Each structure stands twice: as structure tokens, then as C-alpha cells.
Amino acid sequence: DSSISISAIGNVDSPMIRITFQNQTEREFFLNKITDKAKSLGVNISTHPFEIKEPNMVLIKPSKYPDNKLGCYISKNKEIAINFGRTDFRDFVLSNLGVGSHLGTCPTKNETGNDTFYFHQENLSLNGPALSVNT
């Protein structure tokens, strides 16, 4: 069992993604991948938006202009959105979480929102039930 749980949590102003792994080693495996990828793309994730929490969790913290462009926010049509800075970084993170593009909207490379994933409302809502991926 290497399943991952994904929830949207918090409040409208400060929404976050909670990613829960089966154990700390699986969490570390994921983190190593994304930190390695971000550095190559020049996306600065040194302290934002990912943050570990005990046990077994990685949070994606809120975006907040001007402090931080990356992170979670509620879109204008009430979808849970995540800004990843660069389209290749978005695609990499989603793939390595087992979040298929069919679960939301993933604007392509040269489109507005190319850096962002939006979950369909029916798939994920704020303080709603979790999704199980990589099952």
C-alpha cells in the first residue's frame, strides 16, 4: 500500500493542500524528487509552498500576493487551485502524486494558467473529503 490522500483544508483566505503519505520514507521519496526538479527549473521552493507536518504530511501552503505567488488558492469559480510557478514543475508534481489531468483543468504550456492546476469542484472542495490517489 503506497496510496496518498489529498485534501483541501483551511479557510477561504488561507486554503492549503494536505498530502498524506503511508510513511515518512514515501514522503521523503516524493520530496527528494520535487526539490531536485524545482532546482533544475529555477523554481524557488526553499521555504514555500511545501512544508512538512508530523506525521507523514506535506502541506501546500497558500499563495498570497505579494509575499508568494506559488501555492494554493480558491479560484473565481470556487475551484481549489495550485500555482506551481512553471508548467513543467506543475506537470511533474501532479504526475508524482498520481493526480491525473482528468481530475481538473491543466492549461497547456503557452496558455494563461500554464503554471496552475485547478481541481474540478466535484472532485475536491475546501474542508471536504479527501481523494485517494496512487492506490
d(CA 119, CA 124): 6
d(CA 113, CA 86): 10
- CA nearest neighbour of 118 among 45, 48, 12, 17: 17
C-alpha separations of 76 from 73, 79, 80, 87 in Å: 10, 7, 10, 21
d(CA 110, CA 129): 33
The set of residues, in sequence order, having a beta carbon less than 8 Å from that of 14 and lying 6+ positions away, is 62, 64
The set of residues, in sequence order, having a beta carbon less than 8 Å from that of 16 and lying 6+ positions away, is 8, 9, 10, 59, 60, 61, 62, 71, 72
d(CA 122, CA 128): 10
H helix count then E strand count, the chain: 2, 9
Are the CB atoms for 70 and 45 separated by under 8 Å?
yes
Q: Residue 27 carries which DSSP code?
A: H
| Method used to obtain the model | X-ray
- What resolution in angstroms does the PDB record give? 1.1
d(CA 135, CA 117): 21
